[model samples]
Target: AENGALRKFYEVIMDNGGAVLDDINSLTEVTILAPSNEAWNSSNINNVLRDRNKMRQILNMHIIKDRLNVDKIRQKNANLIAQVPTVNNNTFLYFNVRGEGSDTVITVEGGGVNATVIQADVAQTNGYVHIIDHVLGVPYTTVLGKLESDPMMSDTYKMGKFSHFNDQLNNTQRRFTYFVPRDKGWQKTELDYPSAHKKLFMADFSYHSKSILERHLAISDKEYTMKDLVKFSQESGSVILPTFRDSLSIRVEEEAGRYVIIWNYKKINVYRPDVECTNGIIHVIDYPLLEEKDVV
Candidate 1:
């Protein structure tokens, strides 16, 4: 067991003069998603590993691109970009992880990968190691946005319409966090936009977007939408809105130009999903403009 291949791998990495090894060893915080020493030695060890493909993935997720130790990560950005070796032996993986303070966790994601970093920042020679309990996987084809464009979603087609909004805080960039809600979020035209809804929507999409945008900025100043929520973090410093839950809390996360913001943490969350248009993104909300008002 002392010279286990995994253990040996760590030794080799450490012998390479990697700076993160010490940090991994000294740190008290970590999230391992891989098999534990005792777990691997348990009754159905082989069954679990083979059935779950646990060891291969959980172990490989340890590597990262930069020599980002916990403290450095805790200081520099709200999260870290970690490289996880993929199922295909030749490839590796990368995830932009978001967190708060020392309780770093993966937030806003480009897409969901199979494994989760249960234990993070274990020390090694070449780099720090983290363990996961599951194997990691990526989509072979389309991601969420592209998938949304799939025709399978529509059974009987009709003209689709919805609102788009963003912040006009700084008119120059006009950077907006577009909240494209799903179709179900939009009720029949009648219920969709209440009278007050017309007032908000009447404010030029720019103003509507701006007010929504500013509210998110109020959370972190970095404007983002319901989509990028998981990608942003507060523990690591960038997460303005902690989690992006649907129904309970529809939202997204984004950070650009040194400013970070998130939206939808307020009362009205997106009810329906992906209703696209050429000019802007569309999403249906559960309630009317009243929800946005509640945030104000």
Candidate 2:
């Protein structure tokens, strides 16, 4: 006979998509943050479950790749760990553990929502599952939705015509600082396709499009603000931002008390800074991060 609670948990995974269950069961050292059935009922998570991709992201958020207890997490490491990536292996979630014995509290937080552990260390063959009082939130759905709705990114969408960009941002686990080009900046591009027009078969140019977007993204957990760069300017006199693409970086320099970002030798000003999202931050730039010669 199987434990009723475990069975219920497995059913929830199956309902969402059991493909994830195989990954969970195969892990030698894993920690599951299981929300009680009552927790799901109290919240409006129907919008999450309806989308397969978003559902998978939320499930991944609940699983930690390492096995940890409240004491081990606190005593073994620091009490508070920020941008601790989860099973999704993205730098978005954070874990803050405190206290000892019966007073132990582990707060698993991300996507602007968090859950406290209700029960700890339910034994399993390979790892442990802890019950949480509330559903873990994955904010990528909301964040990515905002991207398409925002008028500033209209030109990037018009020229790039890619879904790979969406997939990368939608993962919710990965953190990035995206430099978004505004409308006037895009008007200079020859690649502009009308909003109502259909895009060319993306497979034809996806390889190139992915690179273009990668150039605009700095893959890291740290949210770099203007103040952060100002400190660098005062100390090092320059700030270099690394991206997902190998051998590629965006250089920042302070010229006459104003900061300017240089990509491919083209200097562009930062119009706006630190537009916060669940997964990461977006900064509006005066021009697209790509070079006309590289893409064309």
Candidate 3:
């Protein structure tokens, strides 16, 4: 912004190597999620400054192509999520907007970091500028890799090795929402459904259990966040979502302050929700889902 708020950013760019204000000024319509000089004080920022390329990506991450103001964002983010492409290639910033008018708050999250608009809608002839507090981190892994790294997701990861989902779930080019079981949930399967478990290892989609896992994933177009699920259910008492099955659907409903996913008349608690990933989201289910027709 011309107002000197981004003085540190420009100075760093010039100190390291290049002058990119001319580059930024070239954008016909842009939205700058500018972080102030104070944001540069972070522990990792010095390391970032050491590399000119890293700083380039960081700056590109903050500059988006839209001329979005809170007013436009409020309307678009009402359904609870919106995305704008950063100048960084294929990376995106997700916006969650809430409240009305003066009470409106927008949270921009991506690459495993969250930033809020401290002072928004600083107008320029080109687009808009919104000062923020923190620098966004670049996403380092895909959803599959993210799960594989976590011990909590070991059971789900192991199961994925055999299920069609392993082949299906890991596309960085597209988005997906995978509802996966935790180790606890997989343990429940061993304790309660021994026969089904035995059959599951014998063959991939066997014990009729493949559909069970498939029921948990929703494609990008239908991806529902925890907030979306809760809000949708509040009015309808439940909301139906298409599973990987495409034909059969799953319903989410709440009971005794707990949210449950109903698959084939069974209730599986959503133990945790909104595990962020580069290409998708993960919701942890505390219990295994079952196919409607799967019976001994």
Off by over 4 Å in 1: 1-62, 74-102, 107-114, 138-296
For model 2, where is the 10-residue window of minimal lDDT? 192-201
Better of 2 and 3 by TM-score: 3
The per-residue C-alpha lDDT of model 3 at residue 165 equals 60
From the highest lDDT down, the ranking of the candidates is 3, 2, 1
The TM-scores, one per candidate, come to 0.27, 0.46, 0.50
Regions of model 3 farther than 4 Å from truth:
1-139, 204-209, 253-258, 291-295
Clash counts per candidate, in order, are 57, 1, 0
Write out the backbone clash pairs for model 3: none
In candidate 1, what are the lDDT values of residues 162-212, reduced to their tens digit?
132221222323232333332343343226445533443343443453443
- Per-residue lDDT of model 2, residues 134-217, tens digit only: 666533333355467556567665445554565566556767677777777666544453321222225566666667666777
Pairs that clash in candidate 2: 90-173
Residue lDDT tens for model 3, 1-296: 33555676667668755645666777889888877555556524665567887777777778888888888777776664466777765356767766766887777765445666767888868788887766665334567876776566787776766655677767876677788888887787777777766666555454254566666667655456766777776777566665665743556765754467776667788765566666777777887676324546
